[PDB]
């Protein structure tokens, strides 16, 4: 019954001509619900889940103001950081920002986040206590001193513990039918001979939500990692996720092997065995 809200911003400079490309996305758990793309025609924050479309024009006006202003802030910051790092004006660079909050099943604040990167490495991040910053290098130390003087952590903390938690709660009751549902994995095993003496067993998990899942093989009841392969969890494109795990076994010995599936939507883990 725990939940999260996150925003992800990406700004990429383009020195051949014009302003940086800015993309913002918002998520509740593993469900995207809004986007902004500075190269799109609308120039508005846009809905990406049916349940947010009910929000009124004032909602969209305020969210659009914020992300358009953020795109300008990032533009300025790309310039400032180029200077801090003594980089040329000719190259493209990237700023990334993530922030958001986690709540417990009671809907109360658990944890807040705010972290920033430059060219795919840590730049500055708010600590878990929401009261202090971690600056990765002497460039980020400059930013840290400025942010301390501006009481930026206090401002971030008030949002993370206040508005973030309150709007996450509102969305969870607005999109309840999907956001508060768990879809357990649809599981099955396949069998593929490799040679006269070996075969692959593959354990499939399909259609599950949220994305967190664990697949594990055992042989005669003991965990087995030798001769196994696993794919990264992947989106199906319809709001659900997929994963598989495989093991190579001597042919005839298939019944020794079991696949064990853990997911939030399963009251007890599932066990599968080739018959």
């Amino acid at each position: 019954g725990s939940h999260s809200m996150r925003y992800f911003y990406t700004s990429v400079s383009r020195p051949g001509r014009g302003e940086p490309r800015f993309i913002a996305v918002g998520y509740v758990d593993d469900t995207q619900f809004v986007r902004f793309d500075s190269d799109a025609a609308s120039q508005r924050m846009e809905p990406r889940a049916p349940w947010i479309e009910q929000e009124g024009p004032e909602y969209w006006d305020q969210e659009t103001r914020n992300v358009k202003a953020q795109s300008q802030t990032d533009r300025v910051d790309l310039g400032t950081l180029r200077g801090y790092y003594n980089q040329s004006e000719d190259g493209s660079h990237t700023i990334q920002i993530m922030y958001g909050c986690d709540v417990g099943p009671d809907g109360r604040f658990l944890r807040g986040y705010r972290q920033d990167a430059y060219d795919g490495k840590d730049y500055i991040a708010l600590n878990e206590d929401l009261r202090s910053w971690t600056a990765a290098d002497m460039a980020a130390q400059i930013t840290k001193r400025k942010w301390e003087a501006a009481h930026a952590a206090e401002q971030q903390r008030a949002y993370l513990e206040g508005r973030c938690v309150e709007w996450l709660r509102r969305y969870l009751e607005n999109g309840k039918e999907t956001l508060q549902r768990t879809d357990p994995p649809k599981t099955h095993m396949t069998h593929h001979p490799i040679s006269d003496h070996e075969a692959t067993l593959r354990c499939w998990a399909l259609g599950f939500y949220p994305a967190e899942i664990t697949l594990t093989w055992q042989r005669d009841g003991e965990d087995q990692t030798q001769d196994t392969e696993l794919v990264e969890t992947r989106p199906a494109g319809d709001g659900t996720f997929q994963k598989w795990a495989a093991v190579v076994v001597p042919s005839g010995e298939e019944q020794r092997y079991t696949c064990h599936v853990q997911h939030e939507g399963l009251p007890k883990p599932l066990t599968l065995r080739w018959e």
Partner: peptide, 9 residues
């Protein structure tokens, strides 16, 4: 809902 832009870097 988003947080407004924070202080420049």
């Amino acid at each position: 809902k988003t947080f407004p832009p924070t202080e420049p870097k």
